[PDB]
Ligand binder design. Structure first.
Ligand SMILES: *[C@@H]1O[C@H](CO)[C@@H](O[C@@H]2O[C@H](CO)[C@@H](O[C@@H]3O[C@H](CO)[C@@H](O)[C@H](O[C@H]4O[C@H](CO)[C@@H](O)[C@H](O)[C@@H]4O)[C@@H]3O)[C@H](O)[C@H]2NC(C)=O)[C@H](O)[C@H]1NC(C)=O
Ligand SMILES: *[C@@H]1O[C@H](CO)[C@@H](O[C@@H]2O[C@H](CO)[C@@H](O[C@@H]3O[C@H](CO)[C@@H](O)[C@H](O)[C@@H]3O)[C@H](O)[C@H]2NC(C)=O)[C@H](O)[C@H]1NC(C)=O
Lengths: 105, 157, 51, 157, 157
């Protein structure tokens, strides 16, 4: 005889269709970035400004718990930490705070 | 069509070389052959299709975050509304695009084998019993010199 | 870390070749659009039937 | 294909039981039969398709309204722009999705009957005149014991 | 299907009147004929399809611009985010819609000629050698009075 057929594999890959769910398939590719690398990386060739135990308020005012800037710097974004509480040690209101943060990013 | 998983039931595991082809029992090699055109035109088309779902989305530099003070709740909510809006649109349009174009891809293989099967039945005519399984009993069981020429689709009478 | 990316997210950086990501909605950079999805797998081949 | 409203012209009103099947004139029951597989696989697929256009849209809690004072017209307009934007996107994407997937649904029935017709013609072979209407004149007008077995697709020579 | 650029290889330049039809060599006119129904139903359907990609987008009056002072950078960026968002959505959805519905349009012609070819082969039966090119060698080379009646699909035995 002579037949005409197609390929089959030992692949476990399952996909969904509009007419039937969980169809097992020979070859597939992912469209969904599900994983991240867990590290702060450089953006546009620049490293972020890392404020540490300080926030922008504390850093730009010279809160004594903030590390002072040594050289001229560039940065592509600003990184704060969940425990960056050191801002205005003498209490009061910081005018247009959010605006300044956005403009310094 | 009804070629894939219709009258050609299941599939073959023995084709390490391609996606479509033939299985011949005559007087020699019982192996399988790939159709380097029926297949290398599909991969030329599928990789073209994935690469355009991937790369047709150009996206600019964007910092999504916005920070608002306690007397700016309205802005905060307007901003959240915009983020929820896009999320809802891209989530719905992506999930369905994947769903629909997957069926469009599985049909592509139906239309391909059905045309490859019709590339030999509309060529061999009444020189074989047209078994419904997707297979043809040969009247002069071609040797390996002839069978390798039906791949190119070339016969005589 | 000493890495470069096109897209940084609050838990880390992400490869931005895929058009959709579900890590976090509030990103910075040239990023995949955020979706609430969990699986978006697209077919390149046929259905396995080796019974 | 050209099965539906092509060479099978109009349709039958007498099938209270299903969507696809047969009509036999032989020596007994002049009724119609349903193909409980050709049909129960379509409903398994269509209800699957509606339920995913419905349920693939998850949507969060959202209060769309925003209120602005007479010195906040810009915000008011930015907000209105966002609402008009979504309206335009969902209105256009929905109207077209309905339009396109309706044609994809009507084709589904063409591809189904054309395969059911080809499920018996590619099985009965030259034991009937293949009338273009979508109907076959039987050489040994099968009784009700045989005709009910062509439904399963089972013959002899 | 495999009709267009499959077994009917290339196409004909000689049809100033329509999109689909026939070429007959018998004993008289060597010209081409248009199928004023196979064609005037396609144009009724395509112009319907373009006119709905065009006109299903209703859009309101909108002034996209917004102006912000130097202490309103956040709003400025929120606004830019909204504009980039729509741009990304409409650019991606349009590019792909054009891409996909173009293939849906080229298939439409495959399914049309394949049904027109099957409108005469499923009608003439064994009164011609069914050449794989998409052409039929006539047993009683019909004159211009008969050939113009196969267009309507009308024969005898
Ligand atoms: C930089 O940031 C650190 C924190 O990351 C910050 O240290 C914190 O200082 C505050 C205020 O000096 C501390 O809070 C006090 O803790 C003592 C106990 O040790 C309490 O008695 C204090 O009572 C006050 O608050 C009470 C209500 O909570 C009132 O009832 C009472 O009357 C007082 O007002 C107060 O809670 C806090 O413990 C530390 N945290 C740490 C981790 O050390 C530091 O001051 C910042 N420095 C600068 C320059 O910004
Ligand atoms: C601190 O300031 C000095 C200058 O005041 C910075 O030096 C600059 O370093 C960058 C690094 O690449 C140089 O950029 C390059 O410039 C050329 C043109 O000269 C451009 O074609 C390249 O594409 C690239 O951008 C820049 O020229 C240089 N400037 C000077 C005046 O030498 C230094 O980078 C600053 N430090 C930090 C940490 O940012």
């Amino acid at each position: 005889t002579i037949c005409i057929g197609y390929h089959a594999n030992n692949s476990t890959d399952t996909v969904d269709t509009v007419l039937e769910k969980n169809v097992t398939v020979t070859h597939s590719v992912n469209l969904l970035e599900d994983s991240h690398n867990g590290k702060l990386c450089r953006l546009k060739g620049k490293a972020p400004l890392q404020l540490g135990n300080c926030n922008i308020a504390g850093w730009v005012l010279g809160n004594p718990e903030c590390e002072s800037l040594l050289s001229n710097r560039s940065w592509s974004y600003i990184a704060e930490t969940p425990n960056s509480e050191n801002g205005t040690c003498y209490p009061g209101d910081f005018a247009d705070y959010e605006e300044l943060r956005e403009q310094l990013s | 069509f009804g070629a894939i998983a219709g009258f050609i039931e299941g599939g073959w595991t023995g084709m390490m070389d391609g996606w479509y082809g033939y299985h011949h029992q005559n007087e020699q090699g019982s192996g399988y052959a790939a159709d380097q055109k029926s297949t290398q035109n599909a991969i030329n088309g599928i990789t073209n299709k994935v690469n355009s779902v991937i790369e047709k989305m150009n996206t600019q530099f964007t910092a999504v975050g916005k920070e608002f003070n306690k007397l700016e709740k309205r802005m905060e909510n307007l901003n959240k509304k915009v983020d929820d809006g896009f999320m809802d649109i891209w989530t719905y349009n992506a999930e369905l695009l994947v769903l629909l174009e997957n069926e469009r891809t599985l049909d592509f293989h139906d239309s391909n084998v059905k045309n490859l099967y019709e590339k030999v039945k509309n060529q061999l005519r009444n020189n074989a019993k047209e078994l419904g399984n997707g297979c043809f009993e040969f009247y002069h069981k071609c040797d390996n010199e002839c069978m390798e020429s039906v791949k190119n689709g070339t016969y005589d009478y | 870390d000493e890495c470069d990316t096109k897209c940084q997210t609050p838990q880390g950086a992400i490869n931005s070749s895929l058009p959709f990501q579900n890590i976090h909605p509030v990103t910075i950079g040239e990023c995949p659009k955020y979706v609430r999805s969990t699986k978006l797998r697209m077919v390149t081949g046929l259905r396995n039937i080796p019974s």
